[PDB]
Structure formats: C-alpha cells, structure tokens
Amino acid sequence: MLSLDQRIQTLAYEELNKAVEYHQAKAGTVVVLDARTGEILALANTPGGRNRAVTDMIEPGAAIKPFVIAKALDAGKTDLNERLNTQPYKIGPSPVRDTHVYPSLDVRGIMQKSSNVGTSKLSARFGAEEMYDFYHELGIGVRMHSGFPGETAGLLRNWRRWRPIEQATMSFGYGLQLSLLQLARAYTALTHDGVLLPLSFEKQAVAPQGKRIFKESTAREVRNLMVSVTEPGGTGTAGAVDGFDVGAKTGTARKKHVATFIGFAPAKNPRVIVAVTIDEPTAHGYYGGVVAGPPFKKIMGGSLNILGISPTKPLT
C-alpha cells in the first residue's frame, strides 16, 4: 500500500497554499517523511502543474550546513569545545561573510546563528575530492528514480573543477543543487542515527536497510545542536512547535529568493521530517525563517498530532 497519509497530505497542501498566497509567492513545495523508515507521507506542490518536489532542483543554502558540521565532527576535524574565529574573509576577490560579524563561535553557535564563515572553515579542513564524495554519498547528483517524468539528478560539479572559493560556498549551500525530496532524504542520515535511508512510496513495516554516513553519536549530537536553531537566539524560532523540541535549519537561496525551512521532531527520537520551500516570496519577508517557518510550524505540529505523538514538554 501507498505510504501517503491523506490527513498529512491535506494538511501540507492547505498550509503551503496559505503561505504562498500570504507571501504572494510564485510557487511552493512540501515534503513530509517518516524520519525512521523514510516513507513519504506527503508531497505537496502549488500550483499543481508538476511534481516540483521531484523535478525542480534548488540550491539548498544553509539547509546543507548540518551535514558539513556533522562530517567535521564525525571525522574528528573539530569537537564541541572548539571556538572558531568566524570573522568574515575573502578568498581572492570573493567574500565569505555571515549576516552579522561574530568574532568567534563554537559549533553550536555556527549552527544556531547559521555562520557561513564557520561552516566554510570546517569544510576547508577536508580536500575537495573528499567533500565531493561526501556530497555524492548524501545523494546529491544521484537520481531518486521516483518514477515521475522529468525527475532531476541535481547538480554536483566534478571536484577537479572546484576553485577554493567554490568549495567554501558549497559548504553553505551555493553551487550545488538538489530537489526538495533529495534534501529531505539527506536529513534521514541525521534522524535515523547516522544511517541514510533510500525513501519509499510504500509503507515500511520496519526501517529498510540504509547506508551509514555518520556514527550514531555524531548524528545525536548534531540533532541536539539543531534544536538551538528553533530556540531563542536561533535563526528558526518561527518553526518552534509547542510541546516539542524541534531540530531545524532555515535557508535563503538566490535566484528574487527561495525560502527554505526543514526540520524534524521530536528532536531526540525523531518521528517526522517536514521540508518547506517557498519560491519567490514578494510580501511579508523573504528569509527562510520568516516565510517557510510558519507553514513548517503548522505542518509539523499537525502531523505530530495526526500521528498520535504526545508532547515531550509542557504546552505553553
């Protein structure tokens, strides 16, 4: 039988539409996954021309940063105590900067404040070929074979053509591309304790055999870091869900802007992944947290409710 949950599908499409209209956007997409099995619970596109979750590739922006941070932790290139100099810099003429100047951040801060500088410095501790293989094993550039026509493979440029500035910008999500379904898939490596799942349109009695990408301890620490994104001081507080700890990342691509919000809950033992992108918002903000956060919040909270997941902390 199909994995789609019609209750979540309806909830996803309605909230997506509210957001796209309210922000006077061109389009929008939602993916909802079972965080433990990878089955696809919901897939919503508006307007309903094509399956943009599968056909349209986007630059993930900051939504890629957790994987770089996870890889740096996993390989022992950093730890939870290091404070990195996160002053903006240039490589040749090209700047690498954050929205604010943070003189130093630890890894939690790099996640919480979404530091392009900190993430690029962690990525630079790896060679281009290593980082290329890592992005490829996350599935970037690898077709999903979903069976929808026009399905995209995404874009992963051959590592031999990378300039050093390009490795840096890929680490915070520019210069590589993937569909929203590919991005949601990558997040199963974080929610399923380091094991990337293949995804499925059929119900899974047990989590299928995946592929380990991170140690379990790495994945668990990274999930805890991502909760700071939705707590005060983080960039994605608009995606907080009452009664739950939500690990998330928010991002803004450039096209004009594409606002993205992706997250999972309960963060400690995830049940659901919700990924929202809003194409070309023109009203009431353009950042991922402001535009895609609110629909994420509604779709996640409703999905947890529909699925009978009780809150882990008192409601406020």
Side-chain angles (χ1 to χ4, degrees), residues 65-74 80 107 111 187 189-191 214-229 247-248 264 267:
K65 292 179 181 176
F67 300 102
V68 176
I69 292 165
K71 180 168 174 60
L73 290 166
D74 206 57
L80 299 174
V107 167
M111 187 79 76
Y187 272 70
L190 303 173
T191 60
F214 308 118
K215 299 171 294 199
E216 174 166 301
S217 60
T218 296
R220 291 185 180 183
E221 294 303 319
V222 170
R223 291 204 302 276
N224 177 247
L225 302 179
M226 295 180 65
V227 178
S228 72
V229 172
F264 47 81

Side-chain angles (χ1 to χ4, degrees), residues 119-289:
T119 301
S120 69
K121 291 195 180 185
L122 291 175
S123 163
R125 299 175 184 191
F126 298 91
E129 187 182 6
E130 285 185 286
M131 289 302 302
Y132 168 88
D133 286 347
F134 173 64
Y135 294 137
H136 200 264
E137 74 171 358
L138 287 174
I140 302 174
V142 183
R143 279 187 63 190
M144 298 273 319
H145 286 275
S146 60
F148 291 98
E151 176 186 82
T152 179
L155 168 68
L156 183 64
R157 289 177 53 245
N158 182 304
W159 63 271
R160 302 176 178 269
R161 310 309 302 172
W162 296 8
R163 312 196 192 254
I165 182 61
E166 295 166 347
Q167 179 169 343
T169 69
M170 286 178 229
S171 75
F172 50 91
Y174 304 101
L176 41 60
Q177 295 180 49
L178 77 179
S179 67
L180 192 56
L181 188 63
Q182 286 178 310
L183 182 59
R185 171 175 188 232
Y187 272 70
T188 64
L190 303 173
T191 60
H192 196 48
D193 290 331
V195 174
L196 183 72
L197 291 170
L199 297 211
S200 177
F201 291 98
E202 313 169 2
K203 286 193 279 281
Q204 297 300 131
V206 68
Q209 192 64 21
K211 177 184 77 191
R212 181 162 298 281
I213 301 286
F214 308 118
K215 299 171 294 199
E216 174 166 301
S217 60
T218 296
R220 291 185 180 183
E221 294 303 319
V222 170
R223 291 204 302 276
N224 177 247
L225 302 179
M226 295 180 65
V227 178
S228 72
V229 172
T230 63
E231 291 177 342
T235 60
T237 54
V241 177
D242 192 23
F244 291 91
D245 298 316
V246 178
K249 211 61 188 50
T250 189
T252 290
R254 289 193 301 181
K255 198 88 163 296
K256 300 181 171 297
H257 296 79
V258 180
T260 293
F261 203 106
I262 182 164
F264 47 81
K268 189 182 172 61
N269 308 101
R271 203 66 165 256
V272 177
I273 295 163
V274 174
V276 181
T277 63
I278 308 289
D279 197 0
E280 299 277 302
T282 67
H284 299 110
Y286 59 94
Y287 273 86

